[PDB]
Amino acid sequence: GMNINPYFLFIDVPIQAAISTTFPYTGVPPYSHGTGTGYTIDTVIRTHEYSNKGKQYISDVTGCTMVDPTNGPLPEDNEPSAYAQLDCVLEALDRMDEEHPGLFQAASQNAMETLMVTTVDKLTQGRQTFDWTVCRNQPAATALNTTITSFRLNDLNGADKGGLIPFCQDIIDSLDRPEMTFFSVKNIKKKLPAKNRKGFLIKRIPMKVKDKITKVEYIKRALSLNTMTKDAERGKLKRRAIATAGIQIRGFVLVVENLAKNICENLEQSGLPVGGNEKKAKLSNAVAKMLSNCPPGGISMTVTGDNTKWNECLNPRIFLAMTERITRDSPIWFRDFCSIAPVLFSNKIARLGKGFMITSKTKRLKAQIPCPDLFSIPLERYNEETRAKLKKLKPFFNEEGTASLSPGMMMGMFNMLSTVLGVAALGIKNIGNKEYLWDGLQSSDDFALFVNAKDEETCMEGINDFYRTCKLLGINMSKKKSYCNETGMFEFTSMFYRDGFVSNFAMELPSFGVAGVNESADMAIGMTIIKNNMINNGMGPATAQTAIQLFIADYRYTYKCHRGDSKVEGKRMKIIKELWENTKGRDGLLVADGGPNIYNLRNLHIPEIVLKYNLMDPEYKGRLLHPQNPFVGHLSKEADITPAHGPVKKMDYDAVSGTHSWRTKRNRSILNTDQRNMILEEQCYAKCCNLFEACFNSASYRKPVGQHSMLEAMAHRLRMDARLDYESGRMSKDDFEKAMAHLGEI
Amino acid sequence: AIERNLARMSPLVSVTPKKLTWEDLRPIGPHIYNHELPEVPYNAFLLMSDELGLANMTEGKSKKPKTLAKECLEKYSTLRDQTDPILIMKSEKANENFLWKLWRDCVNTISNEEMSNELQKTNYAKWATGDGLTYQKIMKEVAIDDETMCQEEPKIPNKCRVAAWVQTEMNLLSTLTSKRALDLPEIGPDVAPVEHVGSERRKYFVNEINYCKASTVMMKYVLFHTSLLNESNASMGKYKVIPITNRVVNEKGESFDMLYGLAVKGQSHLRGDTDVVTVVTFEFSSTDPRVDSGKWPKYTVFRIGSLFVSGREKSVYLYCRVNGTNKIQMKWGMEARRCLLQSMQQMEAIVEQESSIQGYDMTKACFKGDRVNSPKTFSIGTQEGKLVKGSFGKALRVIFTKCLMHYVFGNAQLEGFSAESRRLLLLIQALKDRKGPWVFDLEGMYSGIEECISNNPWVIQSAYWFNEWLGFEKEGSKVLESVDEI
Amino acid sequence: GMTLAKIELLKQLLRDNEAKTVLKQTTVDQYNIIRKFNTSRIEKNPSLRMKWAMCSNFPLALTKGDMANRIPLEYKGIQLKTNAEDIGTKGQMCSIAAVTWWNTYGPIGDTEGFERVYESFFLRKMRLDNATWGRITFGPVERVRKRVLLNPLTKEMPPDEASNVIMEILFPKEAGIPRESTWIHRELIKEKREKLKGTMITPIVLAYMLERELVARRRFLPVAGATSAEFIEMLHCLQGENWRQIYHPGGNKLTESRSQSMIVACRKIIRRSIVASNPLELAVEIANKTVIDTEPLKSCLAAIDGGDVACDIIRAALGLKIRQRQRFGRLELKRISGRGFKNDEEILIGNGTIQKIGIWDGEEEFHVRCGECRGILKKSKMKLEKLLINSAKKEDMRDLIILCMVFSQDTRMFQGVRGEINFLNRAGQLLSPMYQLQRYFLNRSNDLFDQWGYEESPKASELHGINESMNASDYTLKGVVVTRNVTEKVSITKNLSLIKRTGEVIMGANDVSELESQAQLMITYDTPKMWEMGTTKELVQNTYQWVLKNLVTLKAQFLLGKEDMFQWDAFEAFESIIPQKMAGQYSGFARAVLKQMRDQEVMKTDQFIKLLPFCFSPPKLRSNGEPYQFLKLVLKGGGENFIEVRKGSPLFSYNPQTEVLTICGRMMSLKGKIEDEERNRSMGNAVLAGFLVSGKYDPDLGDFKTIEELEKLKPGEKANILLYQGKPVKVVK
RNA sequence: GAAUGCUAUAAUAG
RNA sequence: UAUACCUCUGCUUCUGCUAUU
RNA sequence: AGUAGUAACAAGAG
């Protein structure tokens, strides 16, 4: 026979040109299982493993085991070194400051003038943040609310002023409180009369009880970071640990990152924060110059680079120095403000996830061991790998079930600032006036170093030097992953350069599917993804037209909305088929109503509802676009309409508000557990806001501003509304008296 | 300070660079060639090249899944009526009796005149779906007291050797059939010449795949994984007989329903996304499991009569396997259609590239060849150690297949190998481009690739194919050794 | 009378002591925090969760209302909705079948105003509907990555100004402090308010719909000769990498966008015409068949009153009254007397950095205009001399002075640059320093005025000077005066110079702007060989492609006639992307290396193909008779636009193993069109003119000689050459 | 003959 | 104990940072 | 059993 070999394409077409075929993104991503404690412990061990030769001491604040590698002994080998030398970090930054004059104070100015304008609500846009009041992750908006409600009880109203600064002041103040008091709910039974045999009904009501914790127990929770495992970690074998931070420390990180962003935006070699086309442009322009600047006869070489243990090796005390050196001309308060975030990170505590599951196969019994109770059982009862992990964890472990972690940044907390410290290495360019000159691009750990020298033997002298320079900043280049070749092709953040960044269609393929927002949206998204891929990711018109089909299939199967003329059996299909028969203008019907797909390459960017509107039946569009339909939930008649409606966001996809713009029922797992009580807390805030929005219609659109009471605002508006409703003649005397009387009671 | 520190830093700290030479690129994953390791087994969810669909020509308009599965067996009653278990192969930890009883319960239940495809929770179906096999949760208080309760050693993927059936799967899935599976829906009428070029260009690309084995298999995988997910949510606490169905259209344009076998879905109280639902597959196949015995350790096979394949009476077997899937894999199954795009795009890129050179639409040229240009060929594979050239269509199909296998054998092992090997693929391309590439720790770079190669068939075969291709490249390089050498 | 209901509900709400304390404690600011408060963890796998949840009985949640109650519980044995109320909506839950039911047998709502509400989109459709599609072309397209407007706007404003206008339209009461903006869009506010008046659509939607057509959505995209939003919206259909599509949108197209593109056309015509003998011939040839979207260049130049030198040159070339009318964004001038000499110089600015700017020499007079305000300006090299103006609008007078101050390029204007001024873009792209300095001093004026200096006002008849505040003052800005008081037949040389009837020249093709830029509207050339106005990489590829095509003949004709086939229309175009100051030198080199291969038996087809195009520009040898020697041949555009003599390059490299030539990424097979001896035949010979290989690297000769050291050798002298990493060669003269 | 700087519930990247 | 062949649940069994915005 | 793979599910809860 004849045996096919798919790699034999690479004979005809070069790797870069057909890189798409090396990304298996029709296949399933890796997901985690059970506990992240193992994966967390690994980071905790490794961080200290690269710092162990440094200065170890006991924190007389937290009582924790702290290790300080900075200004430590220089490495004897190529094992990851965290032993960065302040002098060399500063010297690097001085050169950067010389190369980019005024940039530090120019950024500091912007970053400072931002903070002054920055409100507290800024914190309510960070997914799941760690809440110290309950010692679990929670929505950013809630995690804040809990902290604000808690703070008020300790006489901390800085939040109420509205600016981020005075709220931040309350956080660093909260540390000096001897005890910290916070609400935590308790159930209470209560007889309620009901049409019942016994003539009543018992129901459990929530009651906010004031819990207290000590100065230390609070500090530790403030310095705490909760840990998970990273799920859907593409192109990797074994999983890795990720960290979420406290509402206390999230404040100060924003400003230190914002500072580094301002610096990065105005750097030649910074891959962040620029992205996609903006990035490709900048890197294409960068390569073009550094290529052509090469000495004639001399060799230009590109080191496709990657740093190992980026998080574990980088030190907070270095990040502290960076802010202090960057804000040199900034006023005393802002110098200090910036200094907090690193100082928190240099005393931070890593939470150890869920724990470890122990089982008996003979008995068929399993049990989770909480992180506090890790050293409850003899370590022989744990497996080999976990035994060593726990043994190595031992000296950094805390009785409450956490790990002291003075060294290390941890996953992605300071990307912008790390990028700056990276660029700072590229800022040197030469060591000892040798016959080479290096200059590259940096995007977090990911870096591409260009070296223009007289011969490749000399280039290596330059790379070897750069390596040694990075070692002094706590930057370890991966000798395994990183490689080098003559300039003309390289790889950077999975962008593959071959005399010009190539097209890699495969990477953004998963985004072609049904997004999972709803029918009306996922159509728009689905077409916009095709439209955008046709432009940016070089998808030809045939593949593009096929993509439409393949989407429409997925859509029709997902939302069970096949052609009304089709004979695909189904519950929705029964009514769809009745609509197909009842309707005259069938070409006007949307796909979701078993209508025909009329999308092509040209009209991808027009909403389906707008495309077909002209050829709909009046009754059908009258139904589909009913102003007060029940699926969307508009405005009202004023009975008592107060649902737990979330703020109407401004998504990039273009879709019309029709019956297919529905919302799914909320996961009710919460009904079984004691968390139930939170629904009442929600539906309270909901009632308050919803009514407020009836007083101020602008609140829905633009953020309302005021440090006064909501009730105060609502009252006056309603008073004016009532007075002018009487004076105008919209309201009668009987009603106005009732209005002024009812408002009087407030 | 940097000078002062670099001066006093140990010379032992360096990148230790070396210029890459072809001979330094040894074959990856040498264990795959060790015969003493076990043959990597067929571990897919459904059968692929070994599949066998019973042809049931429909009126053209659809019916209920029970109804088509019934009427399909009603035609092939000789098989459906076969009540005598002629067992051929047994899975080490399986029950012939229970499995056969289950098969017969499926056949009977799907054959009966009732509405429901529900299965009575019998002692056999309970063993098959793995009833109450989950461990009981207990208090850490009690847990700690018990010394016999311990943290289990992680189960690891064991090492396996190269297996022919993987190569054979590629080969057969890649090849042309008479049958079109794909269900690609309607489009808007074309106006812009771009759309007219796109549509005409589709006719070549879409068909070339639609008329290939991989396509049918993909569509089967999708349409199954749909009904399975639909059942999983709807009928949570119910054992259900899902028929492995798939619609096919022949050259003459006749709609045939293809029943490949019956599957049973265990209780699917799927809370988490990873949370498993045991699915027991009974699949029709002409393939004799005695032939490639090391392929079917996971399966239990019953001879259930014969069929006329043409002039030949091929004996029909029944491949019975206790399998499992989860919410994710089931969803990604329904999103397997996008295999068309990854493959179609990559070749449309070449069509469009070649179109810029010649200055017209090179679609018709690349496949067949026009008056100006002869057809486009690609180095396709080997034949007793000698390179062979294949058609543009073949080259396309080979990728589309590869992309299906990227799903079918898609896991952590593949992700890793694919990503880490890409790094070496480039280091090769540099040697090919003659951009004198350098490496710092080649061994460490290799180990990262070689640790991913365990018990994934597509990984193990991709290592073999990579090693084979590398060898053929390494030869081609010689031509350049003596160039501008005087 | 909705007011009463709200007050009555407030009394109900305030009975919940929990709600009371929330309302009493939570500040209007903190509303933003508690609004977003919820239990719901963010759905990380919605694609899955949807696909799954669609298979459940009741996935959707109705809003508790009389409308929700119009949906029946079941329809023909289909459970449409349940009794169980959702946690969120506190209303009945339902199956997707409910929607399908409502859309079929539901109540027929009033869809009045819909079209006016969603006009933004209906126009988006109307443009595609009333469009015209041209031909698809297959060939190289150099896509440039640039920041463009995604969606056509009704009127462009900053987000802040835009939001404030929307407030004035939709939410009058909760507007806050009235801004200037309010009056500036008074027409648009009333117009929109009168259109959206009768509508039942939720105000929050009308907000985002206005926001969509007032706030600018401006993002980076790969574009090619199409910047206009009404083109950008269709960018996916406009072009690929290797194909182009002509598409004329509908509705209207702006006279400004018609103008700014019309310039690029002329500049591109001239740029290419300069290379041929009788440039006027080709200039006319192309211009007559140059179409701007649907409008002929000649018609456009006639219709539009404005544009740059190039526009006037082409106008003359076609035979149209040349308008020496000029623009500088807001400022618009017309020359009375003077001749401008644009010299690129390194200007120090007030903040303390060095920016490269094109400074204009000579004393010139212009008729400056800004809105309803007019004036006469007089300037010399980096110094404003005298500015006469009218007393029109206070801000129009204020702007004209700032525009004239900047336009003059006075060393005082550069001194008043205090703060951050970006000449370089976030993506390391060049922004026009004069057009950014213009844009900066329109925002910060008080700096410029104080950093300029004042003097005594004029004491003439109708001359009375104005101070900082633009009032008839005693102290006026140094060389500013306010007054009460507000062509000629040309011919064009074949070499493209506009001569007066006397003899003095007013313009020449040497005076047009060198900067190529993305035309706003689609530029089409209705003559065959339109590629000639293309980009560096396009021309480079299309040329070598045409060389490969006719290699059969061109190579043979070379072995018979020496210079017969050096003059080809393809190689002419190709010259227009060669730096004119190296064009001749490159030809001088290439022809010698070619002739060296033909005569001394040592051929190399890949090299022949590479160099042949350069051999068009009349040769330019050194003074000692021998040609100039080169390692790389730099072309117009980015630092990657160069051809390597010895090695391959981002534009051109040959793979002998595959016999595959690679041009701008596109791969072509030289199989069949290759001699048998070539393979073993070294390149060393066809690398330097009058230089051939003798043996291999001789350590006695020492290191490898540079271009200079090579050029400075006497015939029959050995030397060490490096072709590419690890190919040392011993070459002799 | 230039600009206009942003800031999703998706996906990708690190 | 019991109701319980009952009832409730199917991301909430800790999913982070920074870009593309 | 099986899925799966460095740790889980093979229903969980009143």
Ligand SMILES: Nc1ccn([C@@H]2O[C@H](COP(=O)(O)OP(=O)(O)OP(=O)(O)O)[C@@H](O)[C@H]2O)c(=O)n1
């Ligand atoms: N999901 C991710 C991936 C990456 N990162 C950030 O990007 C850095 C680089 O990640 P990667 O290169 O994948 O790993 P390394 O940190 O270099 O680790 P290793 O030593 O294993 O290569 C991380 O340290 C972290 O700062 C992140 O925050 N979240």
Ligand SMILES: [Mg+2]
């Ligand atoms: Mg790394």
